[PDB]
């Protein structure tokens, strides 16, 4: 199931939907916003594509002429890992003010959501952005595992110390 070719098709699709450009609103006078987010013009919205490596962990990409919204639902092995994932995704969501390539709320039916704007696509390297996504996934996995091990270790130590008294 799990492979590296999944994040290669993910990287490729991310490279394909990183072709955005700045575009003014056709409905509102002198307004400029993300097309993929509001989804007001059906003519500017491309066919959203979903990629699943498994029944639990997948990535949904919804592109536009002036936006690219990538939602990522990470793997959920255990309950603790799920609570930790939720907590970390939330903690990252709070700092959406810093991450101008992420959004404050996750997409419905997904773990986390990042809105890569046309403005964001114009003031940052596309290649580096794709690299950022791939690194985001691999780092998500590795960091989650490390956090799990550390937490378990802490519990073991506290239990041993309390039992030794």
């Amino acid at each position: 199931a799990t492979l590296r070719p999944y994040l290669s098709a993910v990287r490729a699709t991310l490279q394909a939907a990183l072709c955005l450009e700045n575009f003014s609103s056709q409905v509102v006078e002198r307004h400029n916003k993300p097309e993929v987010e509001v989804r007001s013009s059906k003519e500017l919205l491309l066919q959203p594509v979903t990629i699943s490596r498994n029944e639990k962990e997948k990535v949904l990409i919804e592109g536009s002429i002036n936006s690219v919204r990538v939602s990522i639902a990470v793997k959920q092995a255990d309950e603790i890992e799920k609570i930790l994932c939720h907590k970390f995704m939330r903690f990252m969501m709070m700092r959406a003010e810093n991450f101008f390539i992420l959004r404050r709320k996750p997409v419905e039916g997904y773990d986390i959501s990042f809105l890569i704007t046309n403005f964001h696509t114009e003031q940052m390297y596309k290649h580096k952005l794709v690299d950022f996504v791939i690194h985001f996934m691999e780092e998500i996995d590795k960091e989650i595992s490390e956090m799990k091990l550390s937490v378990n270790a802490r519990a073991r130590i506290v239990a041993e110390e309390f039992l030794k008294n």
Partner: protein
């Protein structure tokens, strides 16, 4: 409800913690935490308060720099030990009122809210302004006659002394002025003065000795000529003697305290003495702060001048302040009345009984009222809406 909430004002040089409603702090500790030079309970081995100032196996770190937080995790551990080791009160079964700086960022308030609500699961949380509670503490000098949230508050501490204009509980950021001379700088001035005047003092106890000199014998004078002529002509009743114990040899070391006792406290009235990059006196700073604010509230700001912080507890400080301010004021009034082809400008520098810890006193006085239970953001609202629930604190008590 039945129990009492906890109050904690973290200052640059000293952190004041205790229970609201009490007369004084239940624990007034130092603003420093011990750390290692990492997994498991490695973060549980953290010492805060006075028991961290002189650790040798660990390293003494300072968190609160100039009123603002620099390292969040350290402050988190510090609040942890302040809650469990120093206070030992059930956090889930108690509310909490935290203090903010004058230049506290909104995002910073958000972060504080996150650390207090997510990790501690506090039943109540309220982030207050220092000057807001300060004017309230100053409203505990004057009884019921004039207890208002209008006035100019000057909070001087170990890290930074500031002049902030307060109006009806709402501060005027555009009028707020920052001052360079703080308690640590006066302590340092005393250290240098003592370093140049007499010898026979260990270097490992020099700073503490200087602080002692700033504590016991330090007093502000009226003139810079008489305080020296009285020491030169008499010097038998003025010059005091200080005796300490060298921590190294456990022997009685002695020093002579004199002119420095006047100079250190004089550093505020004249910043030109120890700062080449500062020429403005405190009188001018307060004058400009009162003038650069709204004109309609200017009289009120000049009327309620409240002293807050430890660096303002020095003797006859507010006297000289009010003297210079009223002097310049009467001068400008005369100049305006000489070319007038004006009413008496009333000015008063208030000296509160708890002017040393006014920021915490005002908080204890606010948290004791029933309104503090209505004003404080609930844990429910915090979990339902988000951190933005702690972003705007209501002002009541008027």
């Amino acid at each position: 409800g039945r129990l009492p909430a906890c109050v904690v004002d973290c200052g640059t040089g000293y952190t004041k913690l205790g229970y609201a409603g009490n007369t004084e702090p239940q624990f007034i500790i130092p603003s420093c935490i011990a750390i290692k030079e990492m997994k498991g309970v490695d973060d549980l081995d953290f010492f805060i308060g006075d028991e961290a100032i002189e650790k040798p196996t660990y390293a003494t770190k300072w968190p609160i720099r100039h009123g603002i937080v620099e390292d969040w995790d350290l402050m988190e551990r510090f609040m942890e030990q302040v809650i469990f080791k120093y206070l030992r009160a059930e956090p889930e079964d108690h509310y909490f009122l935290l203090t903010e700086p004058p230049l506290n960022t909104p995002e910073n308030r958000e972060y504080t809210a996150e650390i207090m609500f997510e990790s501690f699961n506090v039943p109540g949380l309220y982030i207050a302004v220092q000057a807001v509670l300060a004017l309230a503490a100053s409203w505990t000098s004057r009884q019921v006659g004039e207890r208002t949230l209008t006035g100019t508050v000057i909070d001087s501490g170990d890290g930074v002394t500031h002049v902030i204009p307060v109006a009806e509980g709402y501060v005027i950021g555009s009028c707020i002025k920052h001052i360079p001379i703080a308690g640590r700088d006066i302590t340092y001035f005393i250290q240098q003065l003592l370093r140049d005047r007499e010898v026979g003092i260990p270097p490992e106890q020099s700073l503490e000795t200087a602080k002692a000199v700033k504590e016991r014998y330090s007093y502000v004078c009226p003139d810079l000529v008489k305080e020296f002529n009285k020491y030169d002509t008499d010097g038998s009743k003025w010059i005091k003697q200080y005796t300490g114990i060298n921590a190294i040899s456990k022997k009685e070391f002695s020093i002579d305290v004199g002119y420095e006792r006047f100079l250190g406290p004089e550093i505020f009235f004249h910043p030109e003495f120890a700062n080449p990059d500062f020429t403005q006196p405190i009188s001018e700073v307060v004058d400009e702060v009162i003038q650069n604010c709204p004109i309609d509230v200017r009289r009120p700001l000049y009327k309620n001048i409240v002293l807050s912080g430890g660096s303002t507890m020095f003797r006859d400080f507010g006297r000289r302040l009010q003297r210079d301010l009223k002097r310049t004021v009467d001068a400008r009034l005369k100049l305006s009345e000489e070319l007038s082809g004006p009413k008496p400008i009333d000015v008063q520098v208030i000296t509160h009984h708890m002017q040393r810890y006014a920021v915490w006193f005002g908080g204890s006085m606010l948290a004791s009222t029933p309104e503090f239970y209505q004003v404080c953001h609930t844990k429910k609202d915090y979990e339902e809406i988000g951190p933005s629930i702690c972003r705007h604190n209501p002002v009541f008590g008027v």
